[PDB]
């Protein structure tokens, strides 16, 4: 069989760690040794295990709150943020039982459109949003007037600026190429010969020989090649967002999940943390939308035509007359004719379209195969104001949120996150997968790996295509372990997909080998 | 292949009644499905599962499932007490909101925002054997007293005030209340389109003619021979594929403290801690083999068109003719034959998953700027679960607020392992011609693609075409004589009929004793 | 000859059912009346009034602390005073005079028709949908609002329907096949021309699926009453009449939608034939056969599309859209998951289990008793068909007749 399903493999357990003095629990975990692929069996969702403990030792109490404590959330909030007219808890505790609530933001104020998306962490290795890490609805007062057009906004406490730095870059490149070549010949041969004798002597003798020969040859060959490349792209930018550098108010959920992290290092918990919330958070971003269109046409026609003819004639007549008469007429011929015609017509077309940001109406109409009307591009860019994608991102790793202001043992947790994150970058890399066929890209998807098959390819491994051969791009295998310290080094065999096969495409990226101080 | 025969659906005898469960006053018993009805034949009227009223002679000693937590009367949902009188009915009983003297016990002023539309399907269980929604696993309507909202980026909706001439967008539905079980519900407008189109057309023609003539006359003899062959070959192949995938949401389900649906909760507590296959089988059949924990919400369109045309024509003729003269005699003979064969086959599949019956039908009929735009508009209102990740139904238990449940969880794992290889579609017989076997309840179908007809898709309007094999069901486990057990399966249900693909997976399976 | 149908003797009379005042007989259908014999229209069962030989063991029961309505249904007290009609004839609400509290506090919610009809009864014999046995006007005091999805109108999902998801799908599937041959050649000799064409087109639309609640399900009063009015003994005719009025199954889940289909087949052959025995023949035959089907949607659009579909006319997508949109008004149950109707016979009822078993057996006998299996064979292997009370077969070839007896 061509395919062979490969089941998930994951390691034997770690040791149990020692009982966590605060969590009164102990932990155990396993590493994903091999993701399941090609419809292999998926492993049980138990790469983590947990146990309860006796309290072999106490630990530090939860960090002192000098402010008010929000009853349900336990958000430590400043006493100036009570009776404020705003919920600063995610709960009414701040405003609960206030004798008088002094509404500061009396006006009608909108939140910045999509601002709460940016409070989500991202998995940088996936570039995909995760659970909320920051609370962008916490205003902590504020109520400075921020306007966009006539619409006035209330900025989150966390956000330093959200400002409509509008810009747009269009780019159109059309390249059409034609070649034709034609070749013909016409060629002809005819030969005729006669020889006869007729004499009187009494006696009479006569002889006649007839020869005719014709040869004809024709050849025709035609090639027609017609090639079109059309790449169009619109980069639209609508707002600039920056997070404040300092004293961020975290989201409750992230706060608590951090609170539950073990003080002893055990990768499984920080792994689950990243899988919930990801690895990084967005300090600065450019918000807008992308449209990108790319069509490839190759039209190749060839014709070949051949004609061959041979003709031969022979007749001979010899007659002797002296009454006596004898005659023979003897004649023979062969005709040969060949016609041979071969024609091939091949058309290969592919299109890819890609859109981000805006309303679904505009997104899909732009997802049709026709280049858009300027009107619909206007309508799309109008609607991107309200539902933009994130074009540019500048990120900081999530551990930079872990701050003593919020968490006991902040340094320890921070360091654990660094270590865990480093291991996480290894374990979640796509390098681990078996190679796709068909120039497919393996996307690791938790414990199993999916081949994103290109346009014109199908099946679990992209094994189905009508194209006989197409360039296969090279893919790195996983980088080696760290070389033992006398200097530090890694290597990549560029092997996992071989770059050369099937008119092999690009070689892999550099570097093939990476070296460092220990 | 001639039609296979019907078989009657067949069930084993009843298992014995379970002892009458003290809290439920119910006896239970199960049959096992020894044979579905397969290619027609008498369906079972018997169900695989049965339950009967029975007084237990013993009290519900366990009824005290919860202490300090507030437990609803109707249902074992135990709530953290801040939720009592919190203003939101946190169980179907509503008792947590009953007799609440303290109106200021309400948690927050959230209710103006309605729940995310379409959030309910993310709640429902999934049955991988039938690809059908089950009952709810998650409580889709539970907020835990929290007021997490979600910015609906498509909130814009034109309104015209005739009295003003103002043309404006109505603010309504600018946000949705996120249900507690959703960790995230990222509105994110994406589209990706991919098209390929490949045309291969080849035509070849040959002619070959021989004449061979001899005449010799004084008595007259004259012999002529002709050989001529003409042979035409044409093959025309068109394949085009369009995949346009639109996304509007990414949603993820919390891995912690999953608030099970009330019905699921009850049904779960009713399960015995001892293994009883019938009970857990019923549970899986109700809530599905699998529950979902990752989502995108989208519309999808796919268009596939394949046309093959081939024409082959041949003429052959020979003659030999001969003559003897001076009285005159003439003879001749030879072989001539003529044939033409031609065929064309064409099919299209156009399918849309997305937000309106009218426009999704229209776009299934007719691809255009008009149907793409109007279907995209319709996706504003009725997006669909376009992709999801899932886990076995038993893994929720680890993640529930309840605790270990590990007896139940292991029982459910065993039951699943069985159920997946009892109600498996493989046990419906060979669907020929790439028909899909389906086992619903106790009964089988073959779903036939349009070329095929009949109970097994067996008869075909044309006489033979490439159709793929499929696996038989796994045999029983061997005895494990060593510490290892074996299981065997053959790519013969059906065999690849005309050299279609051999089915890809393992022929042989092996297992720890 | 035709064969006249035949029936069993009457069974013995049952004993008198002490609560039902009645006695019963059974009568098997020995032969259906093949070849257009006498139809067996006569009743499979019979019943007679009886003055009962013993006192009735009452069918009433004490619901205790539950509210017991004017109808037999008992409901929990909180459902009284809901404003919603939680029982028969508002008796749960006529029980209430003060402090009414709708669970749809401060708002109006539409009643979904697709929810009202969900849970269709089904008879396995022709899979005809009967009316839902579920009382889909029972909300159990909830206000779960859902969008129609094809419209922004929000509707209250009834308690029985665990899910009603507008998981819209549209499909068109098309295939064409064309085949053509020309062939030129005691002994037999023939030369032939042959052409085969097949064309198959169907489209499906899915409006959404309902899933009926596995548990705690509340049924119509007439359904439960008709389970009460049942002999407790097995009485073939009385359970058959129950299954005939409710169906042997219900859809525990189903997809509503619309469907259209067009099939075209053409087969053309020309033959020349000459034979010699130790004749000359010329023949032309043409067969052209077209069928057009539409299901669901409003009549105007459904039929306009179906006619425009049947003609070679190219359909303007606007009319197809108008039909597919009107499917929202008149859906059809295009698919279902079938559960045996006796699974709705509620636990906690007198002889509930026994009536379950008896219905199981009655459905067995009903499948069997109306089985075509006991019709005589077709003479040319055509499909035997059980009509109403008579049996025949049909064959498509030149072999023809009420049993294909000739050709
Ligand atoms: C075999 O029968 C053929 C008809 O059954 C007959 O064909 C006919 O020939 C006629 C002239 O002789 C012609 O006018 C008429 O149209 C017809 N053609 C067809 C297609 O039916 C063949 O001649 C006959 N064969 C022999 C050898 O007599
Ligand atoms: C080979 O001969 C053919 C036949 O004469 C040429 O084609 C003809 O060209 C003349 C003049 O251009 C036209 O008037 C005829 O209509 C053509 N006939 C056909 C059938 O093509 C052909 O051009 C010659 N090719 C070469 C290479 O000499
Ligand atoms: C899809 O449907 C539309 C609407 O019926 C069709 O629109 C027609 O397009 C042709 C050109 O392709 C024009 O000649 C007609 O005037 C158009 N009609 C209208 C009302 O605009 C379209 O042709 C259809 N396309 C396909 C591929 O079926």
UniProtKB/Swiss-Prot annotation, chain A:
Sequence positions that bind Ca(2+): 81, 84, 86, 88, 94-95
Disulfide bridge map: 8-43, 19-53, 22-59, 65-76, 70-89, 83-98, 105-143, 315-331, 431-478, 433-449, 436-451, 453-462, 485-518
One GO MF term: protein-containing complex binding
Regulation acting on activity, per entry: Membrane attack complex (MAC) assembly is inhibited by CD59, thereby protecting self-cells from damage during complement activation. CD59 acts by binding to the beta-haipins of C8 (C8A and C8B), forming an intermolecular beta-sheet that prevents incorporation of the multiple copies of C9 required for complete formation of the osmolytic pore. MAC assembly is also inhibited by clusterin (CLU) chaperones that inhibit polymerization of C9.
Localization: Secreted; Target cell membrane
Post-translational modification: N-glycosylated; contains one or two bound glycans. Not O-glycosylated.
Sugar attachment sites: 13, 16, 44, 186, 479, 482
Function, in words: Component of the membrane attack complex (MAC), a multiprotein complex activated by the complement cascade, which inserts into a target cell membrane and forms a pore, leading to target cell membrane rupture and cell lysis. The MAC is initiated by proteolytic cleavage of C5 into complement C5b in response to the classical, alternative, lectin and GZMK complement pathways. The complement pathways consist in a cascade of proteins that leads to phagocytosis and breakdown of pathogens and signaling that strengthens the adaptive immune system.
Protein's name according to its UniProt entry: Complement component C8 beta chain
Gene that specifies this protein: C8B
Swiss-Prot record, chain B:
Domain LDL-receptor class A residue range list: 64-102
SS bonds (residue pairs): 9-44, 20-54, 23-60, 66-78, 72-91, 85-100, 110-147, 325-328, 426-473, 428-444, 431-446, 448-457, 480-513, 491-503
Chain sites annotated for binding Ca(2+): 83, 86, 88, 90, 96-97
Region (Disordered) location: 491-513
Keyword Repeat (UniProt): yes
Record domain TSP type-1: where: 8-61, 468-512
Keyword vocabulary terms for this entry: Cleavage on pair of basic residues, Complement alternate pathway, Complement pathway, Cytolysis, Disease variant, Disulfide bond, EGF-like domain, Glycoprotein, Immunity, Innate immunity, Membrane, Membrane attack complex, Repeat, Secreted, Signal, Target cell membrane, Target membrane, Transmembrane, Transmembrane beta strand
Localization per Swiss-Prot or TrEMBL: Secreted; Target cell membrane
Domain MACPF: residue ranges: 105-427
Xref: Pfam families: EGF_C8A_B_C6, Ldl_recept_a, MACPF, TSP_1
Annotated PROSITE patterns: EGF_1, LDLRA_1, LDLRA_2, MACPF_1, MACPF_2, TSP1
GO CC field: blood microparticle; extracellular exosome; extracellular region; extracellular space; membrane; membrane attack complex; plasma membrane
Known glycosylation sites: 14, 366, 471, 474, 477
MF terms in GO: complement binding; protein-containing complex binding
InterPro entries: C8A_B_C6_EGF-like, Growth_fac_rcpt_cys_sf, LDL_receptor-like_sf, LDLR_class-A_CS, LDrepeatLR_classA_rpt, MAC_perforin, MACPF, MACPF_CS
Domain EGF-like: 428-458
Statement: the UniProt record of this protein carries the keyword Hydrolase: no
Membrane topology type: Multi-pass membrane protein
Marked site: Not glycosylated: 13
CDD domains the UniProt entry points to: LDLa
Stated role: Component of the membrane attack complex (MAC), a multiprotein complex activated by the complement cascade, which inserts into a target cell membrane and forms a pore, leading to target cell membrane rupture and cell lysis. The MAC is initiated by proteolytic cleavage of C5 into complement C5b in response to the classical, alternative, lectin and GZMK complement pathways. The complement pathways consist in a cascade of proteins that leads to phagocytosis and breakdown of pathogens and signaling that strengthens the adaptive immune system.
PANTHER family the UniProt entry points to: COMPLEMENT COMPONENT C6, COMPLEMENT COMPONENT C8 ALPHA CHAIN
Family: Belongs to the complement C6/C7/C8/C9 family.
UniProt source species: Homo sapiens
Swiss-Prot record, chain C:
Glycosylation sites: 10, 13, 280
The protein, known as: Complement component C9
The UniProt record lists the keyword Repeat: no
GO CC annotation terms, alphabetical: blood microparticle; extracellular exosome; extracellular region; extracellular space; membrane attack complex; other organism cell membrane; plasma membrane
Tissue: Plasma (at protein level).
Classification via InterPro entries: Growth_fac_rcpt_cys_sf (IPR009030), LDL_receptor-like_sf (IPR036055), LDLR_class-A_CS (IPR023415), LDrepeatLR_classA_rpt (IPR002172), MAC_perforin (IPR001862), MACPF (IPR020864), MACPF_CS (IPR020863), TSP1_rpt (IPR000884)
Subunit note: Homooligomer; about 20 C9 chains oligomerize to give rise to a huge beta-barrel that forms a 100 Angstrom diameter pore in target membranes. Component of the membrane attack complex (MAC), composed of complement C5b, C6, C7, C8A, C8B, C8G and multiple copies of the pore-forming subunit C9.
Organism: Homo sapiens
Gene: C9
UniProt PTM: Thrombin cleaves factor C9 to produce C9a and C9b. Phosphorylation sites are present in the extracellular medium.
Effect of residue 55 to E: Does not affect inhibition by the antibody aE11
Domain TSP type-1: 4-57
UniProt activity-regulation remark: Membrane attack complex (MAC) assembly is inhibited by CD59, thereby protecting self-cells from damage during complement activation. CD59 acts by preventing incorporation of the multiple copies of C9 required for complete formation of the osmolytic pore. MAC assembly is also inhibited by clusterin (CLU) chaperones that inhibit polymerization of C9. Specifically inhibited by the antibody aE11, thereby inhibiting MAC assembly.
Effect of residue 291 to C: Creates an artifactual disulfide bond that prevents the conformation change required for oligomerization and pore formation
Compartments reported by the entry: Secreted; Target cell membrane
Keyword Glycoprotein: yes
Membrane topology: Multi-pass membrane protein
Family: Belongs to the complement C6/C7/C8/C9 family.
Occurrences of domain LDL-receptor class A (ranges): 61-98
Domain MACPF: from-to ranges: 100-374
UniProt-reported outcome of changing residue 51 to E: Reduced inhibition by the antibody aE11
Ranges for domain EGF-like: 375-405
């Amino acid at each position: 069989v061509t395919l062979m399903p490969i089941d998930c493999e994951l390691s034997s357990w770690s040791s149990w760690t020692t009982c966590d003095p605060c969590q009164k629990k102990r932990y155990r975990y396993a590493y994903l040794l091999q993701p399941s692929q090609f419809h292999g069996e998926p492993c049980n969702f138990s790469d983590k295990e947990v146990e309860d403990c006796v309290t072999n030792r106490p630990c530090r109490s939860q960090v002192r709150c000098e402010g008010f404590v929000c009853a349900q959330t336990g958000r430590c909030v400043n006493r100036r943020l009570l009776c404020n007219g705003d919920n600063d808890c995610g709960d009414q505790s701040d405003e609960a039982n206030c004798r008088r609530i002094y509404k500061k933001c009396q006006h009608e104020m909108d939140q910045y459109w999509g601002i709460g998306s940016l409070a989500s962490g991202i998995n940088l290795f996936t570039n995909s949003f995760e659970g909320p890490v920051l609370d962008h609805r916490y205003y902590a007062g504020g109520c400075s007037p921020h306007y966009i057009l006539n619409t006035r906004f209330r900025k989150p406490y966390n956000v330093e600026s959200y400002t409509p730095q509008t810009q747009g870059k269009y780019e159109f490149i059309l390249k059409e190429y034609e070649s034709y070549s034609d070749f013909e010949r016409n060629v002809t041969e005819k030969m005729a010969s006669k020889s006869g004798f007729s004499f009187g002597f009494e006696l009479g003798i006569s002889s006649q020989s007839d020869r005719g020969k014709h040869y004809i040859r024709r050849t025709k060959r035609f090639s027609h090649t017609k090639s079109v490349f059309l790449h169009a792209r619109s980069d639209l930018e609508v707002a600039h967002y920056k997070l404040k550098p300092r004293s961020l108010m975290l989201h409750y959920e992230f706060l608590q999940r951090v609170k539950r992290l073990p003080l002893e290092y055990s990768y499984g918990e920080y792994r689950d943390l990243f899988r919930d919330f990801g690895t990084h958070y967005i300090t600065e971003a450019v918000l807008g939308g992308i449209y990108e269109y790319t069509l490839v046409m190759n039209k190749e026609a060839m014709e070949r035509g051949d004609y061959t003819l041979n003709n031969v004639h022979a007749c001979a007549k010899n007659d002797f007359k002296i009454s006596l008469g004898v005659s023979v007429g003897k004649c023979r011929g062969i005709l040969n004719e060949i016609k041979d015609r071969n024609k091939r017509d091949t058309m290969v077309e592919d299109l890819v379209v890609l859109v981000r940001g805006g309303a679904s109406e505009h997104i899909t109409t732009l997802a049709y195969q026709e280049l858009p009307t300027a009107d619909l591009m206007q309508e799309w860019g109008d609607a991107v104001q309200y539902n933009p994608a994130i074009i540019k991102v500048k990120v900081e790793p999530l551990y930079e949120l872990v701050t003593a202001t919020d968490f006991a043992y902040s340094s320890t947790v921070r360091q654990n996150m660094k270590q865990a994150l480093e291991e996480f970058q290894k374990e979640v890399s796509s390098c681990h997968c078996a190679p796709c066929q068909g120039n497919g890209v393996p996307v690791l998807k938790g414990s199993r790996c999916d081949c994103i098959c290109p346009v014109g390819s199908q099946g679990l491994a992209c094994e189905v295509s009508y194209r006989k051969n197409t360039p296969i791009d090279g893919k790195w295998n996983c980088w080696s372990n760290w070389s033992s310290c006398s200097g530090r080094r890694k290597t990549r065999q560029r092997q996992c997909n071989n770059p050369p096969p099937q008119n092999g495409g690009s070689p892999c990226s550099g570097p093939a080998s990476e070296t460092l101080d220990c | 292949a001639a039609t296979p025969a019907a078989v009657t659906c067949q069930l084993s005898n009843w298992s014995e009644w379970t002892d009458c469960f003290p809290c439920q006053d119910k006896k239970y018993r199960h049959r096992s499905l020894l044979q579905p009805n397969k290619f027609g034949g008498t369906i079972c009227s018997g169900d695989i599962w049965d339950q009967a009223s029975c007084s237990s002679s013993t009290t519900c000693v366990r009824q005290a499932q919860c202490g300090q937590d507030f437990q609803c009367k109707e249902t074992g949902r135990c709530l953290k007490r801040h939720l009592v009188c919190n203003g939101d009915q946190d169980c179907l009983d509503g008792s947590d909101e009953d007799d609440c003297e303290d109106v200021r016990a309400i948690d927050e002023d959230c209710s103006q925002y309605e729940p995310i539309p379409g959030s309910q399907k993310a709640a429902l269980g999934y049955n991988i054997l039938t690809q059908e929604d089950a009952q709810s696993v998650y409580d889709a309507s539970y907020y835990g007293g929290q007021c997490e909202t979600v910015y609906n980026g498509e909130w814009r909706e034109l309104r015209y005030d005739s009295t003003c001439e103002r043309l404006y967008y109505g603010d309504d539905e600018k946000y949705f209340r996120k249900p507690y079980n959703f960790l995230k519900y990222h509105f994110e407008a994406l589209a990706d389109t991919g098209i390929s189109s490949e045309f291969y057309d080849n035509a070849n023609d040959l002619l070959s003619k021989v004449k061979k003539d001899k005449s010799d006359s004084f008595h007259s003899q004259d012999t002529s021979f002709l050989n001529e062959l003409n042979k035409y070959n044409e093959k025309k192949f068109i394949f085009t594929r369009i995949f346009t995938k639109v996304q509007t949401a990414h949603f993820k389900m919390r891995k912690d403290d999953i608030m099970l649906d009330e019905g699921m909760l009850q049904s779960l507590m009713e399960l015995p801690d001892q293994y009883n296959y019938g009970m857990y089988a019923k549970f899986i059949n109700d809530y599905g083999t699998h529950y979902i924990t990752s989502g995108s919400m989208g519309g999808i369109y796919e268009y596939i068109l394949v046309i093959d045309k081939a024409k082959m024509e041949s003429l052959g003729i020979t003659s030999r003719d001969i003559t003897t003269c001076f009285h005159c005699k003439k003879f001749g003979g030879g072989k001539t034959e003529r044939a033409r064969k031609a065929m064309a086959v064409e099919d299209i599949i156009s399918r849309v998953r997305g937000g309106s019956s009218g426009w999704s039908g229209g776009l299934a009929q007719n691809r255009s700027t008009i149907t793409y735009r109007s279907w995209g508009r319709s996706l504003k209102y009725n997006p669909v679960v376009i992709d999801f990740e899932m886990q076995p139904i038993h893994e929720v238990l680890r993640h529930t607020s309840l605790g270990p449940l590990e007896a139940k969880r292991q029982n459910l794992r065993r039951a699943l392992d069985q159920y997946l290889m009892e109600f498996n579609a493989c046990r419906c017989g060979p669907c020929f011609n790439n028909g899909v076997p389906i086992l619903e309840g106790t009964s089988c179908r073959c779903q036939c693609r349009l070329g095929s007809l009949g109970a097994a898709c067996e008869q075909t309007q044309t006489e033979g075409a490439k159709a793929d094999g499929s696996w038989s069901c796994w045999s029983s486990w061997s005895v494990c004589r060593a510490g290892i057990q074996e299981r065997r399966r053959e790519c013969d249900n059906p065999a690849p009929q005309n050299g279609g693909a051999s089915c890809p997976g393992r022929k042989v399976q092996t297992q720890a004793c | 000859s035709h064969i006249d149908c035949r029936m069993s003797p009457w069974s013995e009379w049952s004993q008198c059912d002490p609560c039902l005042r009645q006695m019963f007989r059974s009568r098997s259908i020995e032969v259906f009346g093949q070849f257009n014999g006498k139809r067996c229209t006569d009743a499979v069962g019979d019943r007679r009034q009886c003055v009962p030989t013993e006192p009735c063991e009452d069918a009433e029961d004490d619901c205790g602390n539950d509210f017991q309505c004017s109808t037999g249904r008992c409901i929990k007290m909180r459902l009284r005073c809901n404003g919603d009609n939680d029982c028969g004839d508002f008796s749960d609400e006529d029980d209430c005079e003060s402090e009414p509290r709708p669970p749809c506090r401060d708002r109006v919610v539409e009643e979904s028709e697709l929810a009202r009809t969900a849970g269709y009864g089904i008879n396995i014999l022709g899979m005809d949908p009967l009316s839902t046995p579920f009382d889909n006007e029972f909300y159990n005091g909830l206000c779960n609002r859902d969008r129609d999805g094809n419209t922004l109108t929000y509707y209250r999902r009834p308690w029985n329907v665990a899910s009603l998801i507008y998981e819209t799908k549209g499909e068109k599937n098309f295939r064409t096949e064309h085949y053509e041959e020309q062939i030129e050649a005691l002994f037999l000799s023939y030369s032939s021309k042959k052409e085969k064409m097949f064309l198959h087109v169907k489209g499906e639309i899915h409006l959404g699926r309902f899933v009926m609640r596995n548990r705690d399900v509340v049924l119509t009063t007439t359904f439960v009453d008709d389970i009460k009015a049942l002999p407790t003994t097995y009485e073939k005719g009385e359970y058959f009449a129950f299954l005939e009025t409710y169906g042997t199954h219900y859809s525990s889940s189903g997809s509503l939608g619309g469907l259209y289909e067009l099939i075209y087949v053409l087969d053309k052959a020309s033959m020349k034939r000459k034979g010699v025995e130790l004749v000359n023949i010329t023949s032309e035959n043409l067969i052209d056969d077209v069928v057009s089907l539409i299901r669901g949607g409003t009549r105007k659009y459904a039929f306009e599309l179906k006619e425009k579909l049947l003609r070679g006319t190219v359909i303007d997508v606007t009319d197809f859209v108008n039909w597919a949109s009107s499917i929202n008004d008149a859906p059809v149950l295009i698919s279902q998951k079938l559960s045996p109707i006796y699974n709705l016979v509620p636990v906690k009822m007198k002889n509930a289990h026994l009536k379950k078993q008896n219905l199981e057996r009655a459905i067995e006998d009903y499948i069997n008793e109306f089985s075509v299996r006991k019709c005589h064979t077709c003479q040319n292997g055509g499909t035997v068909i059980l009509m109403d009370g008579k049996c025949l077969c049909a064959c498509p070839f030149k072999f023809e007749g009420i049993a294909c007896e000739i050709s």
